[PDB]
């Protein structure tokens, strides 16, 4: 018995929608996406997230033929009861004008059926662009999109399969769909202050998407959340393949001490310390003792 949320994933043929879904929620690798075929019509994805939230993923095939069916015969089935619209653009695309027409046709249908829906726009495949031009091209596409989105508001992200940009995009949508998000954010910030941590990250177990966080000292790399999600997810898969299932981790330096361990049925937690001469058990005892208090909130 959980909150069911409808998520549309739309964009042109070849834009990289199934590649996103496969990497984030299907334990996929960047290299093995080039073999993904054209998704016929809508291919749904029931993702169980945190037990209180179920994501109804509608991966909509952007073949112009399928696109016209979504605007006509399937208008009510596709655009009704929508919580989030994730729209994907291929940055390397030639048909920029035609892309915007298909985007606007979706927004019209959204305005008419699910006007409440959160809109995210992903300027995807930024890896095909030279590094020094990536920022310029994105800000240029973003300003256009914010304008072209006319009455409705939209959030824009630069995405690439190989890097953590995927986590930048997905985190916001997933973060903004948590039923207890405010409560969750608060409870984790409470736990963090009590445990005396420099940073506490909370991840969904299966996907490794950051669902909540807390920071003390304003950190340098503002893209670390997605990097850590990418790193540990790759490791998780390597663990189950190469030996046995991942259970827990601890990392140290002269500057830090991090602990990754199972938290709830559907989550993982990471606690980072400004590596003081605190023994590993005193940190692990505090983790175990804090479980009993955050559990009450659910």
């Amino acid at each position: 018995t959980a909150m069911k949320k409808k998520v549309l994933l739309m964009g042109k043929s070849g834009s990289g929608k199934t590649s996103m879904r496969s990497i984030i929620f299907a334990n996929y690798i960047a290299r093995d996406t080039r073999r993904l075929g054209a998704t016929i019509d809508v291919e749904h994805s029931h993702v169980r997230f945190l037990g209180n939230l179920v994501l109804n993923l509608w991966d909509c095939g952007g073949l112009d033929t399928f696109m016209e069916n979504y605007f006509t015969s399937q208008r009510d089935n596709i655009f009704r009861n929508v919580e989030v619209l994730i729209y994907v653009f291929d940055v390397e695309s030639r048909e920029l004008e035609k892309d915007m027409h298909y985007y606007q046709s979706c927004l019209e249908a959204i305005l008419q059926n699910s006007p409440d829906a959160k809109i995210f726009c992903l300027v995807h495949k930024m890896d095909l662009v030279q590094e020094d031009q990536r920022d310029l091209i994105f800000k240029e596409r973003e300003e256009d999109l914010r304008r072209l989105s006319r009455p409705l508001e939209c959030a824009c992200f630069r995405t690439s399969i190989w890097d953590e940009t995927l986590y930048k995009a997905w985190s916001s949508i997933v973060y903004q769909l948590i039923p207890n998000v405010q409560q969750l954010e608060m409870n984790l910030r409470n736990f963090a202050q009590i445990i005396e941590a420099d940073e506490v990250l909370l991840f969904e177990r299966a996907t490794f998407l950051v669902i909540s966080h807390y920071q003390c000292k304003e950190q340098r790399d503002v893209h670390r959340f997605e990097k850590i999600s990418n790193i540990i997810k790759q490791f998780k898969l390597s663990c189950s393949k190469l030996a046995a299932s991942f259970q827990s981790m601890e990392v140290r330096n002269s500057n830090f001490a991090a602990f990754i361990d199972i938290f709830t049925s559907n989550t993982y937690v990471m606690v980072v310390m400004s590596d003081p001469s605190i023994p590993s058990a005193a940190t692990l005892i505090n983790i175990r003792n804090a479980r009993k208090h955050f559990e009450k909130l659910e």
């Binding site: 496969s22 929620f25 299907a26 290299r31 073999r35 809508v42 299966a206 189950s240």
Partner: protein, 1052 residues
């Protein structure tokens, strides 16, 4: 009374998976399809009227029958009348076949007929042509096989040979003769047919013929009727059927019904809601019913189902047979029908007409609302009455074809589809009938409907169809009926019973058929299935997983979609499901998921290794059914990575290492079927491609659930059933044996030296048990299980346990002791196994189920009421195998180095007592956690604790005995002993009684000391006495010496 104890106990290992074999039901030769769709493409209306002049043969009466296609020819003048009759005749045929080339020949020549027929064969190349001949204006056809036409001037009747007529017309054709001696034409047609066959060496079955008359007979001249009587019947049945009704003696029954009211009947022949269309519809039901009941099935599907126009002609021919009969005319057909005129169903027609046109005075004149006929209602009522006591293959219900006609409207569609489901349920024999009568294309057409009320009924009907004939997966995908069911499987408000039928329907539509897999994939099946995978219905969870498994079976597109939706992850939940069907269905799908890799890179390979290791933790599984599919699933993994498993296989003569080690455990399975299938797959690696792929019959066996009946009361609930009476007789016999045994205990246990018998075994007696009620005393050895008796005094049976030469049968139990008893046989190495039909006359040994526990030897404690069984031995663990869930529930740590020599347990107040080899006697409570479990650890011995047994009372007493031979009665709530005794110096084996408190000791020095719990002497019977065994009720004591002998003592 001692009956409430019996009825309220779970019978372990007595369900479908155990009793029946795990095998698919063999589909019979389904011969219901129309293996041809012929069509009557064009029609030839040859009319030889010569309106005005009568031919020489028949001089007609002064009033006379004149009407020709409902036209008076003499009214209109000669020439116009002939065109008009031709026009009307065309219209009449166009009611039945509106899309065919009609081509009239009006008072034709011979050349005129030649050019007409030869042209129609050219056009309708290999499809059927109708030739209608109306010879009312020409002389009667001759014996010499001739039919008359005219010369161009209309001055001479020219004969036309039937031979030449069947030359010009082709092979697939149908002939309608409406003339006087019309039988002669049919005789001579068949003669010339045989004559052509003789000439062909150095068009019989193809050619249908209807004829108005027998060769002798003349057509009736009665002024009330048409001249065109036969043609009229075939082509306008309702018109003559009503006119004929008004000419009979039975009109007396309906006053105010003249011929004039019939002319002015309201309605049309299409609109079933009008009065005329009502009758037309009823008539179509009645004729089609008579035909189905009267004709052999072959000839019915030939005539009444092949093509529309033929079927219409023969339906209407049955009316001609009835009507013309009443005028000394017998119509004649080429594919001869048996006589239908006398079918009871005509009495139904009479009543139907009567009631319908008793209303005509009020409908025409008063303007009264036309009440619909109760015909269809009453016929469904008859069909319903048949179903009540119609469980058998007796005479089928006459009304099947009426049930078909009812589906066509909406008025009675709900009720019919209900009854049709109820019928199809009866068995697969019934589904065969329903498909032969031709229900298929109408049931398939209803899947285009939106009326939500139909959804539960059609889902039921289609599950029953597809359970029998799986070929219909072709038809359902073509018409987009696969979408209809997808909607039902994604509907929370639709009941879970009907959603299960829907999941089965999709699993059949999808089964090994790319068109259906590609279609359901696009209709978003994988997403729909995962939403219903965690339902509170074990059948739905099962089928949804099979359905998920079938869709990605040899279909890489459905696998990729499963990876995106992350199905394999959602399916891991089913691997720890209570129900062993569901666990198996889950194992099936995860295996089918693995098998269709087509050699991908990291994404696919990393997933297969995750699915491998998740399956590899269902080795230690209770159900052998799950373990078979677990092998078959890992077979698909071996076939895919054959190069890697050859590396692992050749080494021992770390992923792949683990999966090969799994197959070694499945190779050394207690159960035979699993060991065999594991051995095949393991040997196909050894000698090194796709040939190795085994398929279990699980999904086919599962599918048998929908062939069998559902709606009706089961056999067990029936109070008057023979199974229940013999079960109640066994329970009455049980309560007596408890009472009679209790009476012997109350007298005070006297001396005990009576020997009931002394027999000798092939092997050394290792372990002995007494069957609670029936005198069956199983005395197993190293391998075998001899079943002796102590009333007759005879050898009843001899098994082989199946275990190797190293192994030994340590422990034994009697599962379901009260009724339909089984025999658990725990081997020392770990193997547990269960035997049915162990001391029967007409039956052999039968191993029900068998599963590796663990890994002293092995100890077991059955708990009939709880349903549990707790293996222990050399290991430092006490497993608790639930036999309802066929899984190891709890693994309690012993906290002891030495072997668990004995194990006894308690229901109600859960207390696992476990003696040990070092000397100690632990007690565990299974409610609390594993760290806490140790309730007590008292040590007052030092040896192999032979038996630490617990009593059935709330005042529990742990009677523990060592090799040194000294009893110490403990309590569960105390840290030290209550009573103390010292019995024998060198003890070898011991047994303790449940009801009374006897203790039957053994000795190295051949003694058999039988003392009380208090420590009093009763006997010291002078002869390694390695097995003693008390009854659960009676004070009888078995013994078995080191020498190959048995005894059974008694207190009188």
């Amino acid at each position: 009374e001692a009956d409430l104890t019996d009825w309220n106990l779970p019978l372990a290992f007595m369900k479908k998976r155990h009793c029946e074999k795990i095998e698919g039901s063999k589909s019979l030769a389904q011969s219901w399809r129309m293996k041809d769709r012929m069509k009557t493409v064009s029609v030839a209306l040859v009319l030889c009227l010569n309106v005005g002049v009568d031919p020489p043969d028949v001089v007609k009466t002064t009033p006379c029958a004149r009407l020709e296609c409902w036209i008076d020819p003499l009214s209109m003048g000669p020439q116009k009348a002939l065109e008009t009759i031709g026009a009307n005749l065309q219209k009449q045929y166009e009611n039945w076949q509106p899309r065919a080339r009609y081509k009239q020949s009006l008072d034709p020549t011979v050349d005129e007929v030649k050019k007409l027929c030869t042209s129609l064969r050219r056009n309708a190349k290999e499809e059927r042509v109708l030739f209608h001949y109306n010879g009312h204006g020409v002389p009667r056809p001759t014996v010499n096989g001739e039919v008359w036409v005219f010369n161009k001037n209309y001055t001479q009747y020219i004969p036309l040979s039937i031979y030449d007529l069947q030359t010009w017309m082709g092979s697939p054709s149908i002939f309608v003769y409406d003339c006087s001696n019309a039988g002669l034409i049919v005789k001579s047609f068949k003669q010339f047919a045989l004559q052509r066959e003789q000439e062909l060496e150095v068009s019989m079955k193809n050619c249908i013929q209807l004829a108005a008359c027998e060769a002798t007979e003349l057509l009736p001249m009665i002024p009330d009727l048409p001249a065109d009587l036969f043609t009229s019947c075939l082509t306008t049945p309702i018109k003559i059927a009503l006119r004929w009704f008004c000419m009979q003696k039975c009109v007396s029954l309906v006053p105010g019904v003249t011929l004039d009211l019939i002319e002015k009947i309201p309605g049309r022949l299409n609109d079933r809601r009008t009065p005329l269309g009502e009758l037309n519809w009823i008539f179509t039901a009645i004729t089609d019913t008579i035909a189905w009941n009267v004709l052999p099935r072959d000839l019915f599907q030939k005539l009444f189902r092949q093509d529309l126009l033929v079927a219409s002609l023969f339906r209407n021919f049955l009316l001609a047979e009835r009507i013309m009969r009443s005028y000394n005319c017998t119509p004649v057909s080429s594919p001869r029908l048996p006589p239908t005129y006398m079918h009871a169903m005509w009495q139904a027609w009479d009543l139907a007409v009567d009631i319908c046109l008793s209303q005509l005075p009020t409908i025409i004149e008063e303007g009264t609302a036309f009440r619909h006929s109760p015909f269809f209602a009453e016929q469904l009522t008859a069909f319903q009455v048949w179903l009540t006591m119609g469980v058998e293959n007796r005479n089928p219900p006459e009304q099947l074809p009426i049930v078909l006609q009812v589906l066509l409207s909406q008025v009675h569609r709900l009720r019919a589809l209900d009854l049709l489901g109820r019928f199809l349920d009866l068995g697969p024999w019934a589904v065969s009938l329903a498909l032969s009568v031709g229900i298929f294309p109408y049931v398939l057409k209803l899947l285009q409907s939106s009326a939500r009320e139909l959804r539960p009924l059609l889902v039921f009907i289609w599950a029953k169809i597809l359970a029998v004939d799986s070929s219909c997966q072709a038809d359902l995908v073509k018409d987009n009926g696969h979408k209809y069911f997808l909607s039902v499987l994604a509907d929370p408000y639709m009941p879970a019973e009907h959603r299960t039928m829907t999941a089965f329907i999709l699993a059949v539509i999808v089964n090994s058929y790319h068109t259906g897999q590609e279609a359901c994939l696009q209709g978003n099946l994988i997403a729909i299935c995962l939403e219903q995978l965690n339902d509170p219905h074990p059948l739905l969870r099962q089928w949804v997983a099979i359905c998920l498994g079938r869709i990605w079976q040899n279909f890489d597109s459905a696998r990729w979609c499963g990876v995106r939706d992350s199905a394999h992850e959602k399916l891991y939940s089913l691997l720890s499901d209570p129900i062993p069907e569901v666990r198996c269905a889950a194992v099936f799908a995860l295996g089918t998921f693995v098998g269709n890799s087509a050699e991908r890179t990291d994404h696919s390979t990393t997933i297969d290794h995750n699915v491998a290791m998740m399956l590899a933790q269902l080795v230690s599984d209770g159900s052998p059914m799950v373990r078979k599919e677990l092998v078959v699933a890992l077979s698909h993994l071996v076939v895919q990575y054959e190069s890697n498993f050859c590396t692992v296989a050749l080494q021992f003569i770390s992923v792949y290492t683990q999966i090969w080690r799994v197959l070694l455990h499945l190779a050394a399975d207690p159960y035979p079927e699993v060991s065999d299938v594991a051995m095949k797959v393991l040997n196909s690696i050894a000698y090194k491609f796709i040939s190795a792929t085994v398929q279990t019959g699980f999904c086919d066996w599962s599918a048998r659930y929908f062939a069998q009946p559902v709606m009706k009361i089961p056999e067990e609930h029936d109070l008057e059933s023979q199974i229940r009476k013999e079960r109640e007789w066994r329970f009455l016999r049980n309560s007596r044996v408890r009472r009679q045994a209790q009476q012997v205990i109350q007298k005070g246990i006297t001396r005990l030296d009576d020997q009931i018998f002394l027999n000798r075994n092939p092997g050394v007696p290792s372990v002995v048990k007494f069957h609670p009620f029936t005198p069956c005393i199983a005395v197993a050895d190293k391998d075998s299980i001899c079943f002796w008796d102590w009333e007759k005094g005879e050898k009843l049976d001899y098994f082989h346990n199946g275990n190797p030469r190293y192994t030994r049968v340590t422990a034994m139990e009697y599962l379901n002791g009260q009724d339909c008893s089984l025999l658990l046989t725990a081997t020392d190495d770990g193997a547990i196994r269960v035997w049915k039909n162990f001391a029967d006359l007409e039956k052999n040994p039968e191993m029900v189920t068998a599963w590796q526990g663990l890994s002293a030897g092995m100890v077991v404690d059955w708990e009939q009421e709880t349903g549990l069984l707790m293996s222990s031995g050399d290991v430092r663990i006490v497993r608790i195998w639930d036999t309802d869930r066929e899984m190891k529930v709890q693994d309690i740590p012993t906290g002891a180095d030495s072997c668990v020599t004995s194990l006894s347990c308690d229901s109600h107040r859960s207390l696992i007592v476990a003696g040990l080899g070092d000397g100690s006697i632990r007690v565990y409570d299974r409610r609390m956690a594993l760290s806490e479990c140790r309730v007590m650890t008292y040590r007052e011995h030092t040896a192999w604790v032979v038996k630490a047994s617990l009593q059935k009372r709330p005042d529990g007493h742990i009677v523990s005995v060592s090799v040194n031979g000294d009893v110490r009665i403990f309590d569960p709530r105390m840290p030290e002993s209550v009573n103390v005794l010292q019995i024998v110096k060198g003890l070898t084996a011991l047994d303790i009684h449940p009801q009374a408190d006897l203790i039957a000791c053994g000795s190295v020095n051949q003694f058999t000391a039988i003392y009380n719990s208090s420590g009093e002497l009763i006997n010291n019977i002078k002869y390694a006495i390695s097995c003693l065994a008390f009854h659960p009720h009676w004070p009888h004591l078995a013994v078995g010496s080191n020498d190959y002998y048995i005894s059974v003592y008694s207190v009188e």
